[PDB]
């Protein structure tokens, strides 16, 4: 199951994504069969979706965050006078 | 001019004095001016009339003592000039102004114009060569060796929590309250008066105050204590008199963790500690939580870090580490810190010079602070 | 049963409330519950230990007020079901709920939780016949009498322009942020302890509330305002006591677009209405730039409009014409909105009936909304 957006307006953004699923059914009906394949697919493509919109609107905020912040570790913008004329360590 | 500085470390309660690269401060009297209450007839008596240290704390029955400061807020400018004066003296230091660079400190987020008002002191009256003003907190972790970590403080005046990480000390989560050592000293003598032993004089409330540093413990369990009756242990005064004491040696520092008792809903020391460590962000909270150091006279209670432990497992989150170090010379870590940072080469760099000063003025002293 | 409904207009400031079709909401109060400090020793006392409304505006000194709802989302349920009572109350509406269906408002992008649990209070404690949640932004357009334009507004708990285009609420152009007039006030409360005044208690904190309303102002030049030295304009506190307000009055509003300041990472209310007009398509941008209105009571500041206008000015691409329109009751244009919406015959479609919440649940509330 693969996804794909691709947003070039000042500058690139791509959304790339995939899901394997193997999945193991039992045959009963016509009726049946046509309804329980389209169940598993409903369901996993909005599991899907839903991780695809809710964990990345929330999460990459969080890891795209972990690997640089938003803010320091103090929350303060750092002082460019502080940095020009302190010393650290021992 | 770069001589050996001088490191006045302020205190609401305390005041210590020395020089840069010691182990202690080797001047630390308390701070207040005693002045005299009777009249003078007879010849050969006590001269000058305006007591500070050592003669005052011998002398307390003739002097109707006044603190100048308060909360870590100098109401009376006169009296702390004049102790400054004191400080530089014969009778302590034996230097002058002149020569030495000054190293002092004042309790966070404080009044400005207290602290315009301090280097316009140390600048004009005295004539000092380079001032710099400081955290309580930041020395304390200089005094220790580490740099990341919560800072609890517990002084006559402010109770205040200051987390640091890595020399960044976080000026947005500064939790501080005006409940304090003082407070708790007055809410004793409060309670000795329901108790039946009444001390209402100015030289008179000196012996609750000592009364609190010997005689008072921090129960753990308070509601336990208060359904169980007290043994009524006994205590000596300077007259000779005896003082059946009661419950109010235990109820007496419970203030400072129920600060409800004295009809101010504020937080207490508990809950700053807490609050500080929260307001700071996810990443550094556990590191803050690991690295808990004390200061100040008032966590010198009996239980006082057994209580703070529990009072963090009630509220902080379940399983993290919780450890709550304490130095030996927590009256003086303060000070060590600041001897310490004077020490430094870094230290002539951070002042203000009495040059900077009369060019700028006060904006540049509020800029090289933060 | 369709009786005339109720338009209940939710804030974490301030609570409006009363009929629909109506010009002005006749009952509005803020949003919060008094409760006594003081030991109530003599008869004839305040009774019912629960104040809400006027009440606790007028004995403010005697109640430990505490807010239910910080950034339009409830903490204390309890708190909100007796603010909700004290509403349908003989006190204020003198009606039943019963009677009338019920129009709610929310902030937009809440936690569901939240509104799950406001509809099951309405339904199951209250006996409400039919219960509609809706958007602030939606009905402030209703009550100005446009479709489209961004909704730029700023309450006492959220910030947020949702952008919408001829009866078209994008969902996912709605920005918003959770700092507003409360985290103003408790900037302005700090910055008030550093020039010298503290204000730690409950009742004492409305008052940095009402200098905060009166006495402040947004200077479009930030840097130039910091590098000249204030006047220090007086303000005269409810009990008598004067207050030189100094450099905070100017520096506590700009929180709103410097969010760093308090120490949490936000946008700011300029980026934020930058930012939902960007997220809509190409083609509807400069329309959404030509209709922005203005909400809430935190946009009220003096030079708040002229500085949102510099900022835009900034940021925006150049060469498009900008207009940030207003109403004359800022602070009553959403209730105006919902009173229009409620009184159209429409208004019985989109709500969710007792009978239909019974049959289907929380998922039929869900549908009925988006």
Known sequence: ?90 | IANQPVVIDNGSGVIKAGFAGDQIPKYCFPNYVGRPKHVRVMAGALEGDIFIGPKAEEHRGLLSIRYPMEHGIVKDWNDMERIWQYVYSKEQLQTFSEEHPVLLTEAPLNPRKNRERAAEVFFETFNVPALFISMQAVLSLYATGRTTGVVLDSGDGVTHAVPIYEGFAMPHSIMRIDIAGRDVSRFLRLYLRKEGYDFHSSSEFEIVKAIKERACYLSINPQKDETLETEKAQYYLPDGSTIEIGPSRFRAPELLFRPDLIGEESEGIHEVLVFAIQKSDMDLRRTLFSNIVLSGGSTLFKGFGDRLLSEVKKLAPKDVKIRISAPQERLYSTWIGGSILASLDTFKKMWVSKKEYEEDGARSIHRKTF
Do not use: C
């Open chain 1, 1 to 90: 199951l693969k996804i794909q957006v691709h947003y070039y307006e000042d500058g690139n953004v791509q959304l790339v994504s995939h899901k394997d699923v193997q999945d193991s059914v039992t045959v009963s009906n016509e009726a049946q069969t046509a309804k329980e394949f389209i169940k598993i697919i409903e369901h996993a493509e909005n599991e899907y979706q839903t991780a695809i919109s809710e964990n990345y609107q929330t999460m990459s905020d969080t890891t795209f965050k972990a690997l640089r912040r938003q803010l320091p570790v103090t929350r303060t913008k750092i002082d460019w006078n502080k940095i020009l004329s302190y010393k650290i360590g021992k």
